[PDB]
Amino acid sequence: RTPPTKVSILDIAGVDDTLQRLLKEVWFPLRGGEACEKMGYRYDNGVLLHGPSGCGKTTLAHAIAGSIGVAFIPVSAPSVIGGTSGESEKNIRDVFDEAIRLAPCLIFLDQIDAIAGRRESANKGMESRIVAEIMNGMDRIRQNTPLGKNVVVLAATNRPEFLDPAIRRRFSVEIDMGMPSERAREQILRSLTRDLSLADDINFKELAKMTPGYVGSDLQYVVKAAVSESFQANIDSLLAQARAKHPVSQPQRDWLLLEAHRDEEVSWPSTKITMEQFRKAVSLVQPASKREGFSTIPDTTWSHVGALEDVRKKLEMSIIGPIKNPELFTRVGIKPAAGILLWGPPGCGKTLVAKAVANESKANFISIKGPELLNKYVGESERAVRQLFSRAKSSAPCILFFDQMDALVPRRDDSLSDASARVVNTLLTELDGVGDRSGIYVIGATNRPDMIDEAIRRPGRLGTSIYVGLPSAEDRVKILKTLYRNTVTTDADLEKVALDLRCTGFSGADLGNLMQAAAQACLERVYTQRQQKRKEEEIEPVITMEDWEKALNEVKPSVKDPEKYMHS
Amino acid sequence: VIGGTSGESEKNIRDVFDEAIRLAPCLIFLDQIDAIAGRRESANKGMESRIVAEIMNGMDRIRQNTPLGKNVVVLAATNRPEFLDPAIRRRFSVEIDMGMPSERAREQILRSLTRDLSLADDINFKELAKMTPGYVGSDLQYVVKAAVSESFQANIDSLLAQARAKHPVSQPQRDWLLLEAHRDEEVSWPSTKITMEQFRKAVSLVQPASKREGFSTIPDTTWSHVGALEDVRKKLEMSIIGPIKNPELFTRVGIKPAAGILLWGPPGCGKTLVAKAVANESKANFISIKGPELLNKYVGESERAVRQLFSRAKSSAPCILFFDQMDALVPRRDDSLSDASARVVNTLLTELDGVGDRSGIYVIGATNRPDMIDEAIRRPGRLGTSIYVGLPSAEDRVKIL
Amino acid sequence: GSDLQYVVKAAVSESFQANIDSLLAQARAKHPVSQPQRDWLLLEAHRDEEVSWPSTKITMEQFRKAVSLVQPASKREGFSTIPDTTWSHVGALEDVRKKLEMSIIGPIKNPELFTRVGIKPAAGILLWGPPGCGKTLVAKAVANESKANFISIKGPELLNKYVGESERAVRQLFSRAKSSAPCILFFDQMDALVPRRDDSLSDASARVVNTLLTELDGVGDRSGIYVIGATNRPDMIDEAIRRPGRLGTSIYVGLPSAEDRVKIL
Amino acid sequence: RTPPTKVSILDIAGVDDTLQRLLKEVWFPLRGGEACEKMGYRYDNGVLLHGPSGCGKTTLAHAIAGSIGVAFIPVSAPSVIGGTSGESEKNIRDVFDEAIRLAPCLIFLDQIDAIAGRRESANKGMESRIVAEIMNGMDRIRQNTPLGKNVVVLAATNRPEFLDPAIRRRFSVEIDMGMPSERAREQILRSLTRDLSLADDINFKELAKMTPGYVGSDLQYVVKAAVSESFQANIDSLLAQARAKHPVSQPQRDWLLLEAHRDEEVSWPSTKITMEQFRKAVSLVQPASSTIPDTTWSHVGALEDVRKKLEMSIIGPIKNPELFTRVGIKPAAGILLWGPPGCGKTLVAKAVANESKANFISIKGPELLNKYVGESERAVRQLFSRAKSSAPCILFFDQMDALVPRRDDSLSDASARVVNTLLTELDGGIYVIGATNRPDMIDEAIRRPGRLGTSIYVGLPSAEDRVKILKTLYRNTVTTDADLEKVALDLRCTGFSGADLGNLMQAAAQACLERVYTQRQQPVITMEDWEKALNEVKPS
Amino acid sequence: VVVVVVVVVVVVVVVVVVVVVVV
């Protein structure tokens, strides 16, 4: 009945585009209805707020309500149910009547989908009647009003697709708040850190750059996480007092020490948050978008990738580059989104560079292991693909890595069945929806490009093809040095091993097998070495040049026909 | 919190959060939150959907109605975080992953469990931690419970002999009958220290929960059952048996703690026999796959079983996966291979060597047709080494006979 | 009718835009953070201090702005007005223009002139060639020089996750296409909707090939609809399509000249 | 559940054989139960009606119910299923109990196949339990009914094979409502047109001949379409009256004119439906099922020798089935047309199909070959599966030498499996026509008598025949006739077949369009258009 | 009024098949 005059517009930031639409669609036909009365125009606009969960929908609808000043009727869907089938409609009939009786008025149906789901699956009689009562109540607004003191019903929900189409048709105005951009997140961070003590090194613009895919709720956790880091020094001092009072692992003792006193509360000095604590806070906070379905960042760096300079240049100029400098690349017409289909013989490093790109781009990473999205139920197999891109867009920039993609988009022959074709078509449409300025970088890897659909390789789709093939003799030297370096002979002996004619067809995996064979040959030599020198555990196994000599003899290339993989 | 009335169930949850705010500073523990906060998208029921929405409002009332200096923390525990509603999972600012304990953690757990017990001085907890891979904190409790019952084994035989000698059908049925008439006839149990040998016996008796589904029994074959195959035994001992027993030694020279071996050769030469010896002589966990037994008639279930298969081998490392007659599970990817079998080959390609790390899983394959296996599988990283188990020689038949 | 109601609703909001800026200007003059936030704070200040919004009327310039902001419901699913593309946007391809002006453009303009010499309409054209060469561009030029309605619906965009609805969608496609005659249906990347009517098709893709075949028989003579299909692999398309009378005559759109590439670059 | 005395026996026709069985199996154990009572034997008969959809299954069960007069309980299978799993059995248990409580009674389980499906594949618990509930409810009828009165269960379904064999066994009487024949369709048409005013030219036998593959529902639309055409004259007269009363587009005014009067009613003259409107109505109505070709003998030029052979083995034994059957002339299963390609083999088969008024299916060669072991033979069997259902039907196998090659030793196991399937189907009102240009490659078991043992050679025209064909082609599309002689007698048409002459006419037509285009930059088909058409058309 | 727990119908699934080739 009264506005909630405790949250203001200043407390909600980053919604500048959303607040612009809400000015001419909610505020105006609630306070300046006289102009509409002079104009003679009924306002039947049902304003619907939708977007990712945590974007500040509930808070905004309460901040707007407190600012407009007109009578406000907050409605919570679970609180509508009282304990009787007929009483549920009584609560709804007591809202649309009260708003009409107290027009102009604002109705907020928070979590509308909790009582406005799909009626097709609504088997229960009570559930299907609440939707009918709600939808009829909107027509009464258009009828029982002077066409001047309009009543606007505002509904907020994080699942706009769950609304009954009988209801969503009645909500003409739909406001997609979406996720805030880099400029918007800076505004939120400044707004959030307004009652706190801060240092001078805090660059909120820098903080916004390295928090992609965060929403207003997620940015609140980053501030909250940084506050805890600011109090870390005030806990160690509290721990030290407990240690000095008392003459099991260390963390357990800390709980036991603080459990002891529980009454001798000591003053926490009022320190301020530095910039180093904010960087620590961002790492500790996982955004709500990255909670589910996002793979862990691989441990592979460019130091783990030997040679492949041509592939590295293409990857550092099409994916890693645009992620680091989205403005430098967009000046030369390089859009911050790409689709790359890595292909080549097996064992040559297609997955290795994709794991290095995911790790060297510092961006979000989603990995799909072949036909991981297929499900035995109807529609759920296709919904997984659509939901896959529903989070890749929300967490842009994001890297989608389809490993062994020939199993997910096979050639649409007669022997395909009406289950994977429905997924290939869905995957084709989603790749079309990936905008040039969307921020999704799709990487595909397959070792049999002759079995992958040719429709996936068109522009807009995975139209960029990078060939990863067998290394040359000079190329294997970089790879063999890279492999030996990452496991610890020096580097001059590695050139002799890699340039040997017995490694003519070796791929990247074969060179790794060569090193493992030499390592096993060392241990066999060590086992006999420690039996002649002993009959004390001080034996030193070291990979010697003679171990490489017998490793070259017993290792053959895993690739049979190198030219079999150059045909597509 | 579930009530029979049409609104009682939601009211109970509203009462929980309102009470906590009234009782701030308060800690709320929602144990098994996935039971009531499942995805309402798939949980197509109005009460279930309105229960989830009431929790969202409750967790927001705490953030606003609590006065300064009196905070309310909402703890929640669930072993299926993927069942949570994303609108609710986002409402937890902190997610803590308590994975399976490591060797250092298991030693600490055993000390905490064996804290109020009369232990012996020969107990080497750092040895017990290394001999129980894949155990969780709940499994280690059963090892201690099994060890305690073993200590009373000598206290039960004495008690049985007391009843058996007090008055003159198999023997175990007699024991129950004697104790059936021995009710309220309490006899003192002299408590004794739990020997270190009882703990080793207790570990064998306790099977960890990760090994209670899909894990095959260890074969009884040993190296005394295998004749000849001296070269094959050396390669298997260096590639699998070696790193399983001494992981530290092989890590020093730079050998990844994972192996892939493809045993191939003419039929009847001992490919399954030596794979059963490795699975038995390595003293590691064993999962045996009998040909194309992972295939399912539903869409995506065949590849789900393969992915779930490695989800068990990885969590119980070191583990040995034996694919007997492997050519039926990884045929060459041709245009005539159909999609049901081609989607399984690619799933096994990503599991053996992909983005994910499978260190601690050792894969053995046996087949009479090595040339019919996909060329991507037969590369270092998936099945790196091929061992030829051919016909015995003249002097090998003597050892075999 | 629904879209024109949105245009009126859009024009009304634009008509009240001037009454908010004037209200904002008064608040600014009273008081010597992003701009939208200030607007809420400025209007929060007065509130009860009601100022009479002047009663203005909608002009024609506001209606023109409203039309641009409003996307008609027909453009949601590929129905579009006559394209703005002329033959001046199409470089070279003189041979293709002559074939199109005698089999498509001609019969659209004079449906009676062609029927006098026993030339039945709806001859059926399958544009094909490498991607990016102007197959959709030339189809937009045909739609504009024919002065007929143009629909650009792609094979994969019409697919829906249900039994029968993919083939039933095609029949509704020609139902509205018929109501707006003359109309040009452009099936882009048609090789994914009609690959080949073999025995191994299942009664889900067969229901779309059979439905599309019947609709192509019904086309042109009765209604003025000329269906155009595009595919880049003229070996992956169904043989039931490329028969005389439905989709016979094949025109290859590709190989741009040097001057056409200059405009694109 | 009272019997509706609405649809009568007169309103259901063509079921004379069906109505004879239903008299001693439904009427007797519902009205004359006393005779069973004296003998003391309950008569429980579950009558099952099955056939193509639209054959008049639902209507028959309601016409019988209204004539018997006993209590009637209409049951629709989908409405039995309720929201709760247990409620579905509740609906069924409230039916078989009600019939027992209200014996004697008639139960109509319309669309029984919607719930009595095969519980084998119906692995869901509810699906497999409806069938069990249905079967138990029928046993209670046999047990708990009195000796005096019987309860008859009538079930209708268009897919009798989908019924659970545990259920189809409970329906002893099965009536397969096939499709009506020419004699039967005449009875249906007369029954439908019984309360209408008709003219004297209406030949119901002619209507039945030219409506093959129609069912009772389709024939109701044909009657409904002709009735609307019969009122077209009554609307123009109605419009003129409104115009004469009142001195915006025309259709809007017509609505406004009729809104004026309303209560003021003027007489509609009682006109009658002619036969020409019935012929127009049939064309406008497309049956749910192929279609008689539009090619007549006026489209076929010359070929008099071929026509006589075709008019004596196929076309004759269709128009007068009794005149030919009087002298022992069985209708040969078909004709094997052979000759060079493009000479009118498909054209004449379409002409035979049109003067025979039967359905036509054309196969353009090896369309039936499949890479699978069974679908290639199933396509041939499905070809004859529809041909029987739409009898009379003409099956035309064009270029049949690729579908039935000679079964030599070098044949493998793919074409032999197709020849055998085709041989058995030809043994099983279907007129199969085959065409091939290499008769030395077709199996000799096909060309035996009873199978396609009649061979008619359709060959290239010499010179006079092309004149008739070119005149025929030009006549059906609108140069005069003197120029057509010059074109056909030109030495450039030496090897032209029938298709080449058709291609020649299209080339001349295209040459006309080129002339119109240049005329409008600075239409009658002229001789100069033929001049450039002769150059650009090859015999191929 | 007391809301009771009521069981409902089940979802449908997909099944893969194998098809022979005469070639």
Ligand SMILES: Nc1ncnc2c1ncn2[C@@H]1O[C@H](COP(=O)(O)OP(=O)(O)OP(=O)(O)O)[C@@H](O)[C@H]1O
């Ligand atoms: N732009 C923002 N500026 C400041 N705080 C924000 C912003 N967006 C969100 N928040 C904070 O995050 C929380 C948002 O709660 P709210 O219920 O509005 O989330 P939501 O977007 O509506 O999602 P849901 O509907 O799933 O609850 C509040 O604590 C609010 O302070």
Ligand SMILES: Nc1ncnc2c1ncn2[C@@H]1O[C@H](COP(=O)(O)OP(=O)(O)OP(=O)(O)O)[C@@H](O)[C@H]1O
């Ligand atoms: N340039 C390289 N430098 C060092 N090691 C390399 C290089 N290329 C490949 N390797 C080694 O080979 C392994 C191959 O891993 P990856 O999965 O990328 O193989 P692949 O080339 O993708 O073949 P597949 O098709 O079997 O996946 C790497 O993990 C690494 O051990």
Ligand SMILES: Nc1ncnc2c1ncn2[C@@H]1O[C@H](COP(=O)(O)OP(=O)(O)OP(=O)(O)O)[C@@H](O)[C@H]1O
């Ligand atoms: N080297 C050997 N020493 C002793 N016994 C052997 C040896 N090789 C084979 N055998 C005997 O032959 C049996 C064959 O069992 P196994 O399953 O290994 O056959 P296989 O060699 O794997 O052939 P396949 O894989 O074709 O089944 C063994 O169980 C053992 O009894």
Ligand SMILES: Nc1ncnc2c1ncn2[C@@H]1O[C@H](COP(=O)(O)OP(=O)(O)OP(=O)(O)O)[C@@H](O)[C@H]1O
């Ligand atoms: N033998 C017939 N005599 C008269 N009218 C008939 C006959 N057969 C069908 N009809 C007419 O056609 C329609 C048939 O209705 P009905 O519902 O019985 O069809 P059906 O054969 O049961 O097929 P479906 O199962 O699709 O309903 C009615 O309008 C009926 O008047």
Ligand SMILES: Nc1ncnc2c1ncn2[C@@H]1O[C@H](COP(=O)(O)OP(=O)(O)O)[C@@H](O)[C@H]1O
């Ligand atoms: N006697 C004829 N009169 C008119 N047109 C004919 C005649 N013979 C053949 N044609 C024309 O030749 C074309 C091909 O006919 P036909 O030979 O039956 O089919 P196909 O060439 O496929 O075997 C038809 O379009 C028809 O118009």
Ligand SMILES: [Mg+2]
């Ligand atoms: Mg919210």
Ligand SMILES: [Mg+2]
């Ligand atoms: Mg790889």
Ligand SMILES: [Mg+2]
């Ligand atoms: Mg074996």
Ligand SMILES: [Mg+2]
């Ligand atoms: Mg019926």
